[PDB]
Symmetry: D2
Subunit: 119 residues, 4 copies
């Protein structure tokens, strides 16, 4: 796993985000078990509760590009700092990466099971 290259893809995705309501763009990138990278950016909506997280876009892009399992994940904010996914996004990642998905956090790389136990 090339974590700097994954973080670079996440920062590039962050630059594409639609976040005019919060002013808080987010980008995410993940390695799929076939070796390819998929990315997402957040897309906010005037009805706040319809906003899509970057991880939502990433999971949609996972299947649009052929499916598979996530093996490594990173998320970054508009300053390029590492972000831990919100609880909803942890649940999406669990479905497609499982407990052993590696998650890039500001405190260090963590298995998803350490971030969402008993899921």
């Amino acid at each position: 796993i090339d974590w700097p290259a994954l973080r670079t893809q996440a920062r590039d995705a962050m630059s594409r985000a639609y976040a005019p309501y919060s002013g808080y763009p987010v980008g995410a990138a993940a390695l799929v078990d076939d070796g390819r990278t998929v990315t997402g950016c957040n897309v906010e909506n005037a009805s706040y509760g319809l906003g899509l997280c970057a991880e939502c876009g990433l999971v949609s892009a996972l299947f649009a590009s052929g499916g598979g399992r996530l093996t490594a994940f990173t998320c970054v904010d508009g300053k390029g700092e590492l972000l831990v996914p919100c609880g909803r996004c942890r649940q999406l990642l669990h479905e497609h990466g499982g407990p052993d998905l590696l998650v890039d956090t500001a405190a260090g790389i963590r298995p998803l099971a350490a971030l969402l136990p008993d899921a």
Copy 2:
């Protein structure tokens, strides 16, 4: 607008969907104002309320591919029938296509204004 080509793209996207809980795959495709096509497929979740509609993935892909405004939209189910987006997805499409967005339905081509007035 080449509606048959857009429907073919939506059906292609539908074949990639992750809908093991309902068994109801959905694909969507839309023309962007710069002329390119974006697509989405639905992605269900063990927690049903976390499922992403095909139109969610389509809007995520819109910005992942550089943004823009949507001008024409088609959605299809697993047997190729035209589907009308749910209310949530109508609101997502309103944000990025507005009332003039053309929606391919079994009743014909309808502007989004007629499917979600006063949004």
Copy 3:
């Protein structure tokens, strides 16, 4: 249907909203087919996409208080002005009130079918 009394319940609900992120509180009230009134207020979340609309809370309160069908609906903002529900909330109302649910709008009372056709 006593529309002023329903709007009064909606404004009271609006005063209870949790909307620190947008500063945009919303209250909703509805008449159930058994004669009782149910209400909701919006509840925002630090992850914007997890925010619950007032109509979401209203539909949860509909079942917590015994279920039934909605017959009249009104939604108000922090100035007490009438609001049309977003597309997601129109879809929730359709499930529990159907096309003939009466919806209070600033332009006048409308059946839900006029706000969410072909649902």
Copy 4:
């Protein structure tokens, strides 16, 4: 904390759920810092992704009944088994209960911090 009384309330709420699509009713109950109990049940939707978890309805009811902070939480399925909230609902509970919120699980009483670290 009277955990049996809280579980009885969650089971009561579960019996009111609207889950005709999955056939999987869920109820939740929580103690508020002022001492009162709030409850929720899940409400599914024909568009699966619009379903509301029991914890969504519980948080809606928290503010509908005057707000506060959650201190203890229990969730049960249709046979009375204790359920751990999905990631989305963990995030909702974090907003209104924080890491010290006590969560009733089959592994015992766990603080939310241990179920959703670094939120």
